């Protein structure tokens, strides 16, 4: 059944979408040989989230859900996985993933229309359990980056928009996880409570939506889940992995009026620890990374609903071309793989790296 009474990953199987599978099979495999080619075909079967990064990407959500509806007839019990990611003045503390809407030019109204579009799809497919990550980077930027003019000015718009998202997508077949950055961002002891306050306030302000299950961490990042050996670049932070992060912030959510908040954590680029990061804040196309813990609801953890692959490995974080639009200097750092295409575009050398360094291995 589509509705759920607790962990929304229980009794379902996350669906591996055709979009990523097409990228692997048609963009990666023709360039590979032997063992690597075979291993790549296997990656295409690991479920990762589909990002709805533009409004005209919404038909792809429908096509995925149509596939799932079909597969659910043949005994199967599959769930759809999507990222809601189109805020006006998006990615306010970076330049690589700037979006189609701006606050100045009716961006809030356009965002509401975008949410309206997604809501209709979810109603159309009320028979399918649908797992959503809400707006990566946004709320975390509001906690830590009010010193960035673009974020400071986006505050009221972000909170209005996110309130609209979590209220309009509050439906019985839906589970939403608000993006909550990662251990090396919001996990810092001094940021934990302010972050928890903001998250609980979003939840409370939205009348405690039943579909709002908790938080998503490590999205498009690389931190370890439960590594017992803290990496050099984590120096100074007692919260050096994602398990420590969720177990630190969880009780603070409860303290601020959000009880029963649960978590999902991205491990799609977390297989190699330590990573090739020379600094913890180096987020763009990081070298020395591999595909990580496979998506699974068997987490052996009180707070983690599921390990997930949110950022699809192989899809670029940003262009390394200083002369191109949306160039962010982070993408030209020593530990950023180069040359890199536009954010979201296929990045073959990066896919090859992730496959080579995969743990668990595909090879």
Ligand X SMILES: Cc1cc(=O)oc2cc(O[C@@H]3O[C@H](CO)[C@@H](O[C@@H]4O[C@H](CO)[C@@H](O)[C@H](O)[C@H]4O)[C@H](O)[C@H]3O)c(Cl)cc12
Residues that bind ligand X in the complex, under the rule CB under 6 A: 91, 93-94, 97, 136-137, 144-145, 182, 184-185, 188, 220-221, 279-281, 283
User: If you compute the radius of gyration of the chain from its CA atoms, what whole number of angstroms results?
Assistant: 19
Among residue numbers 19 through 38, which ones bind ligand MAN (CB under 6 A)? 19, 21-27, 31, 34-35, 37-38
Beta-strand runs (E) in 210-357: 212-217, 262-266, 304-308
Quick one: which of 87, 176, 202, 332 contacts ligand NAG (CB under 6 A)?
A: 202
Q: Is the peptide bond before 128 cis (omega within 30 degrees of 0)?
A: no
Could you give the CA distance from residue 187 to residue 181 in angstroms, rounded to a whole number? 8
Question: Which residues lie closer than 8 Å to 298 by C-beta, 6 or more apart?
Answer: none
Closest CA to 222 of 336, 105, 326: 336
Per-residue contact string for residues 209-248; x = within reach of ligand NAG by CB under 6 A:
----------------xx-x--------------------
Q: CA 320, CA 106: separation in Å to the nearest integer?
A: 31
Considering only residues 32 to 91 of the shown chain, the ones binding ligand MAN according to CB under 6 A are 34-35, 37-38, 41, 44-45, 76-78
Q: Does 10 bind ligand MAN (CB under 6 A)?
A: yes
Nearer to ligand MAN among residue 138 and residue 353 (C-beta): 353
Task: Please state, in angstroms and rounded to a whole number, the distance separating the CA atoms of residues 218 and 304.
Answer: 13
- Cis amide linkage into residue 353, ω under 30° from 0: no
Record the tokens describing residue 160, joined without a space.
């209005």
Residue 33 in tokens = 């040989």
Nearer to ligand MAN, 12 or 171 (CB): 12
* Closer to ligand X by Cβ: residue 26 or 279: 279
Distances, alpha carbon 47 to alpha carbons 42, 80, 140, 158, 202, in Å: 11, 9, 26, 29, 29
> 3-state DSSP call for residue 206?
coil
Q: How far apart are CA 73 and CA 3, in angstroms?
A: 17
163 binds, among ligand MAN, ligand NAG, ligand X, none (CB under 5 to 8 A by kind): ligand NAG
- Shortest separation between residue 67's beta carbon and ligand X, angstroms: 28
8 touches ligand MAN (CB under 6 A): yes
# of chain residues touching ligand NAG (CB under 6 A): 13
| Distance from C-alpha of 163 to C-alpha of 180, rounded to nearest angstrom | 15
Does the protein bind ligand MAN through residue 1 (CB under 6 A)? yes
In the complex, minimum distance from the CB of residue 51 to ligand X, in angstroms, rounded to a whole number: 11
Q: Dig out the tokens for 40 from the structure.
A: 């790549």
Does 208 engage in binding with ligand NAG (CB under 6 A)? no
* Residue 272 contact, options ligand MAN, ligand NAG, ligand X, none, Cβ 5-8 Å cut-off depending on partner type: none
Site for ligand NAG in 139-158 (CB under 6 A): 156
**77, 117, 153, 163: which one binds ligand NAG (CB under 6 A):** 163
- Does residue 4 belong to the site contacting ligand MAN (CB under 6 A)? yes
State the Cα angle at 273 between 184 and 338, rounded to 5°.
Answer: 85
Q: What angle do CA 84, 195, 331 make, to 5 degrees?
A: 60
Judged by CB under 6 A, the chain residues 278 through 337 that form the site for ligand NAG are 293, 299-300
Q: For the chain, how many helices (H) and strands (E)?
A: 9, 8
Q: Which does 228 bind (CB under 5 to 8 A by kind): ligand X, ligand NAG, ligand MAN, none?
A: ligand NAG
* Closer residue to ligand X (CB): 31 or 279: 279
User: Which token pair is 157?
Assistant: 């718009």
Least Cβ distance, residue 280 to ligand X (angstroms): 4
What residue ranges bind ligand MAN (CB under 6 A)?
1, 3-8, 10, 12-13, 19, 21-27, 31, 34-35, 37-38, 41, 44-45, 76-78, 348
What residue ranges bind ligand NAG (CB under 6 A)?
156, 159-160, 163, 201-202, 205, 225-226, 228, 293, 299-300
């Amino acid at each position: 059944t589509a509705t759920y009474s607790g962990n929304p990953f229980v009794g379902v199987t996350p669906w591996a979408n055709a979009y990523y599978a097409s990228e692997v099979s048609s963009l990666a495999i023709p360039s590979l040989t032997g063992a690597m080619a075979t291993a790549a075909a296997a990656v295409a079967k690991v479920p990762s989230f589909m990002w709805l990064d533009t409004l005209d990407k919404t038909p792809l959500m429908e096509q995925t859900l149509a596939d799932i509806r079909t597969a659910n007839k043949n005994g199967g019990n599959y769930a759809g996985q999507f990222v809601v990611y189109d805020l006006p003045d998006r990615d306010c503390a970076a330049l690589a993933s700037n979006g189609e809407y701006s606050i100045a030019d009716g961006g809030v109204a356009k965002y509401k229309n975008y949410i309206d579009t997604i809501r209709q799809i979810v109603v159309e497919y009320s028979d399918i359990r649908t797992l959503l990550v809400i707006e990566p980077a946004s709320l975390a930027n509001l906690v830590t980056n009010l010193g960035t003019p673009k974020c400071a000015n986006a505050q009221s718009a972000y909170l209005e928009c996110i309130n609209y998202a979590v209220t309009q997508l509050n439906l019985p077949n839906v589970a939403m996880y608000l993006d909550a950055g990662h251990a090396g961002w919001l996990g810092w002891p001094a940021n934990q409570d302010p972050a928890a306050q903001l998250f609980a306030n979003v939840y409370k302000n939205a009348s405690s939506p039943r579909a709002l299950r908790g938080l998503a961490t490590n999205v498009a990042n690389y931190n370890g889940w439960n590594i017992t050996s803290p990496p050099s670049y984590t120096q100074g932070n007692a919260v050096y992995n994602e398990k420590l992060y969720i177990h630190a912030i969880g009780p603070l959510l409860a303290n601020h009026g959000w009880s029963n908040a649960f978590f999902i954590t991205d491990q799609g680029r977390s297989g190699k620890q330590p990573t090739g990061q020379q600094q913890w804040g180096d987020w763009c196309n990081v070298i020395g990374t591999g595909f990580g813990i496979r998506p699974s609801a068997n987490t052996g953890d009180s707070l983690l609903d599921s390990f997930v692959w949110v950022k699809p490995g192989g899809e670029c974080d940003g262009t390394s071309d200083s002369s191109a639009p949306r160039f962010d200097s982070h993408c030209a750092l020593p530990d950023a793989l180069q040359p890199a295409p536009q954010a979201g575009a296929w990045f073959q050398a990066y896919f090859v790296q992730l496959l080579t360094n995969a743990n668990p291995s595909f090879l």
